[PDB]
Amino acid sequence: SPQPLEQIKLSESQLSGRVGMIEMDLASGRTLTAWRADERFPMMSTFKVVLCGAVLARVDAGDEQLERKIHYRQQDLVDYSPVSEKHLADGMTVGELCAAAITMSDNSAANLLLATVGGPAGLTAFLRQIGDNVTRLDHWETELNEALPGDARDTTTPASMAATLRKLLTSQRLSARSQRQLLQWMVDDRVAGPLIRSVLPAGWFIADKTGAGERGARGIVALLGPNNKAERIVVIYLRDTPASMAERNQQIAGIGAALIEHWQR
């Protein structure tokens, strides 16, 4: 592979789209590699990690329980509800909903959860409360994936998303149990995790959440590292490309490969 920057440049050129990236030390927060780190990209399903961060903060405060059962109706369901559609009769626990949202990208699950944190506005308020003054949610699923050109709604920046993921995962903000739970849900991703794990060299930790939207919008937030250890946060977003899903996937993979091959910093 080319050097990480060379590769990212190549991906923009080949995709005719905009790429945003940050690679960050998890322990210290040190920014190692960056590209358009301050430019805005649609979060898409990557927001479900921050969502469940907010849910866990409520659990920590005693205003919520992961065991609480939520009951809903079929009329409440939105496009793509692989787990939630199976539980119209019995319902789902808050914890099960976070599992479905993060591990299966279940969209109705995400909406049921978003309600409990005060909706898009409530989640945005949460972000500002932990010192993210950039990331904002404005829509529910599935409108949050529209990726309208120039639209600031429903967006993050690579730098802000990496900072916020670090804040949720390693700072005093969530309880130890909540920090471990948010990570495990990412470890347990069924959508892209097993695929990624299958092509990573032996010895590499991966945990992740992916997203996809309109106009070529694609992304991943990931924890990655050698010697079986979650060493770095990696955030990669693409927007405004006409390319196939396969090629968008391949380009993000190539960027990952460049990072892994040229890891020592």
141 is in an annotated binding site: yes
Active-site entry in 11, 23, 45, 108: 45
Structure tokens at 52: 């469940």
Instruction: Give the dihedral of Cα atoms 118, 119, 124, 126; nearest 10 deg.
Output: 30
**Angle, alpha carbons 4-8-9 (nearest 5°):** 120
39 is in an annotated binding site: no
Alpha carbons 55 and 63: distance in angstroms, whole number: 9
Structure tokens at 177: 């149990």
Instruction: List the domains of the chain with CATH numbers.
Output: 1-265 (3.40.710.10)
231 is in an annotated binding site: no
Contact criterion met (CB below 8 Å) for 219 and 40: no
Contact criterion met (CB below 8 Å) for 70 and 90: no
**Residue 45 known to be catalytic:** yes
Alpha carbons 127 and 136: distance in angstroms, whole number: 8
Alpha carbons 237 and 220: distance in angstroms, whole number: 7
User: 């440049």: which residue's tokens?
Assistant: 9
- In order of 125, 139, 154, 157, 253, the CA distances from 134 in angstroms are 11, 16, 10, 7, 27
Q: Residue 80's CB: how many other CB atoms inside 10 A?
A: 17
Q: Residue 36's CB: how many other CB atoms inside 10 A?
A: 19
DSSP 174: S
Structure tokens at 255: 């960027």
Contact criterion met (CB below 8 Å) for 34 and 158: yes
Three-state SS for 25-88 is: ECCCCCEEEEECCCCCEECHHHHHHHHHHHHHHHHHHCCCCCCCEECCCHHHCCCCCCCHHHHC
- Experimental structure resolution, Å: 1.8
Alpha carbons 112 and 186: distance in angstroms, whole number: 19
Nearest to 116, CA basis, from 142, 98, 90, 138 = 98
Structure tokens at 150: 């120039």
Active-site entry in 6, 67, 85, 143: 143
Contact criterion met (CB below 8 Å) for 37 and 233: no
